[PDB]
Amino acid sequence: TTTATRLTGWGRTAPSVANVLRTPDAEMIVKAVARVAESGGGRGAIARGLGRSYGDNAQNGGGLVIDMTPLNTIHSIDADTKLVDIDAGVNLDQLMKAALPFGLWVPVLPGTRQVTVGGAIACDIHGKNHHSAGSFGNHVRSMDLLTADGEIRHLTPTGEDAELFWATVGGNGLTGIIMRATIEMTPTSTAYFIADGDVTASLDETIALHSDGSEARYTYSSAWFDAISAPPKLGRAAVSRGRLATVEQLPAKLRSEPLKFDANKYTFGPIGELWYRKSGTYRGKVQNLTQFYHPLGFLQYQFVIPTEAVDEFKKIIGVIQASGHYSFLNVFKLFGPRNQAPLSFPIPGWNICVDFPIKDGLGKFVSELDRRVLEFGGRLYTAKDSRTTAETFHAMYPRVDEWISVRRKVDPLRVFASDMARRLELL
Ligand SMILES: Cc1cc2nc3c(=O)[nH]c(=O)nc-3n(C[C@H](O)[C@H](O)[C@H](O)COP(=O)(O)OP(=O)(O)OC[C@H]3O[C@@H](n4cnc5c(N)ncnc54)[C@H](O)[C@@H]3O)c2cc1C
Ligand SMILES: *N(O)c1cc(C(F)(F)F)cc2c(=O)nc(N3CCC4(CC3)OC[C@H](C)O4)sc12
């Protein structure tokens, strides 16, 4: 039933060999776990979704990895309660297409639709609407968790078992296997966005745009920013903000199916600077999911710095541009309020995603970035991380001990284990 497979995260780095189970039969998954629990210690088990996490949180070298993608039954969708009851292996793309005809919108979407509900919960994923909607965990009304004792537990965010529910959110698989969840969806009357585009010339302008109160007018906000140019250019951005459109805001051609699923010589001169300002500046543009949300040998790096530490954030950015490591795909956003999950990554503050080409000295440079992020009160994201230390991680998440204590109640014999758990000492 299990196949010895060579696994890696999305970054295609740090491989380890695991016996991978792949079954639609929930019963065989249950017996598998009990089989891991019976054989004493061993290197335990971990669930895996679509493998989109860049790090080592869904591989388990020398142990068992359970592939959850064949558990992809959508059980029910209800437009009146706005609830969706789905297996953990359903992906958000499948969920998005199933839910649209009910006037229901997946409440948190990440940069790719190929992620499982299970993965979305376990990494407590965020998106472009974090400042208005929180993260994925905020919208989960219930989940069924297969715990180390072989029993399936029904968890809810309030009432008893709350502690365990909030340990599972952003718990990277380490409380057990989410089999099934109920999600509350966002009502919508269209599959479209209405978007305002703003272009800044400086980091200080980017920050001001995000501090002037304009952010409250928009449910979705993000920006591509310059991580390469010298200041004051550094941190100039193409900002894209907006909301889901209502049917009366759609052009006529689109009002009958409102919920339809869907370099040159001038380039571095002043004429292109002008083109770039023009084409990035607009009001009330209607856009489908792709145009607005997916507008598009590397090391993905993501951090958030708390809101108040704006000087510190600016400094980190400068260290990056003077580093001699050049990143082109840079996404910036201001996160809103955090949730109660002790290992949830997002906090209110300045979030950035960069992508460095693997080069001589990068490894030791990002270690130095880790220290700055730590010192400035931020954290890195397990979904993006393959290489930080246990000591850095623990200090970045001061509620880790509180989280560890919950995991020890639910998994006393350390039945659930991963490459990340051992590296980050969450085992
Ligand atoms: C191109 C790209 C863009 C991205 N953009 C964003 C973004 O904008 N925002 C964001 O937050 N993230 C983003 N991500 C990261 C991605 O959203 C998360 O890594 C997500 O957790 C991946 O889902 P997955 O199903 O592939 O899970 P995997 O990568 O297979 O697993 C991730 C973690 O979830 C756990 N897990 C999976 N299934 C279960 C289950 N059934 N029960 C318990 N635990 C489980 C795993 O054990 C592992 O710890 C991006 C990734 C890529 C490749
Ligand atoms: N950081 O990676 C990041 C943060 C956010 C936000 F929610 F915090 F704002 C959003 C976000 C995103 O929407 N997309 C990202 N992509 C990274 C990789 C990608 C697709 C989208 O970019 C080009 C390449 C083809 O794939 S990251 C991101």
Residue numbers in the entry: 7 to 268, 284 to 317, 331 to 461
Cite, word for word, the article reporting this structure.
After BTZs have entered the catalytic pocket of DprE1 containing the reduced form of the flavin cofactor (FADH2), which was generated by oxidation of the substrate, the nitro group of the BTZs is reduced to nitroso which can then form a covalent bond with a nearby cysteine residue (Cys387, Mtb enzyme numbering).
For 12 (same as BTZ043), the enzymatic DprE1 IC50 value decreases from approximately 1.5 μM after 10 min of reaction time to approximately 120 nM after 100 min of reaction time. The nitroso derivative does not need to be activated for covalent binding to Cys387, yet the time dependence of the inhibition is much slower than that of the nitro counterpart. As was proposed previously, these data suggest that as 12 is reduced to 8, it immediately reacts with Cys387 in the active site with little chance of escape by dissociating from the enzyme. Unbiased difference density maps, calculated with phases from structure models prior to incorporation of the ligand, demonstrated that all five compounds formed a covalent bond with the active site cysteine (Cys387). The complexes with BTZ and BOZ inhibitors induce partial ordering of the 315–330 loop in some cases (compounds 1, 2 and 12). In fact, in the structure of DprE1 bound to 12, some very weak density (below 1.0 sigma of the mean) can be discerned for residues 318 to 322. This weak density fails to define the conformation of the backbone sufficiently well to justify including residues 318–322 in the model. Still, this weak density indicates that, beyond residue 317, residues in the disordered loop do not contact the BTZ inhibitors in the covalent complex.
